[PDB]
């Protein structure tokens, strides 16, 4: 009797394995990926984006904006001492 037709019916091996699910994710995801990002934000020259550029970089954990920002509040109230005295 003639061989049956199972080997040639493939359309439930298109969901049949788990990486089909992953495939339909990364055919979208990686295809819509850019070569490099859009932009990281670091500066924009609003003149305080420069503050971010010098101090608040991705790799700058350096305490300098803190010191500067602290010193700003010291400059503020010290003048206000002379506003009240």
């Amino acid at each position: 009797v003639s061989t049956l037709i199972p080997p040639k019916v493939v359309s439930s091996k298109n969901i049949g394995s788990a990486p089909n699910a992953k495939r339909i994710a990364n055919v979208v995801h990686f295809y819509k990926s850019l070569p490099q990002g859009p932009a990281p934000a670091i500066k924009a020259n609003t003149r305080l984006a420069r503050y971010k550029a010098k101090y608040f970089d991705g790799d700058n954990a350096s305490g300098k904006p803190l010191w500067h920002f602290a010193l700003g509040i010291i400059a503020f109230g010290y003048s206000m001492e002379y506003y009240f005295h």
Binding site: S2, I5, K8, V9, V10, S11, N14
Partner: peptide
Amino acid sequence: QVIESFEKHAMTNAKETESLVSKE
């Protein structure tokens, strides 16, 4: 009579699979 009928369904299904997986 039976071999040609069988061959048509088989061929269709075979080609469908072939083109589908080649594309994939």
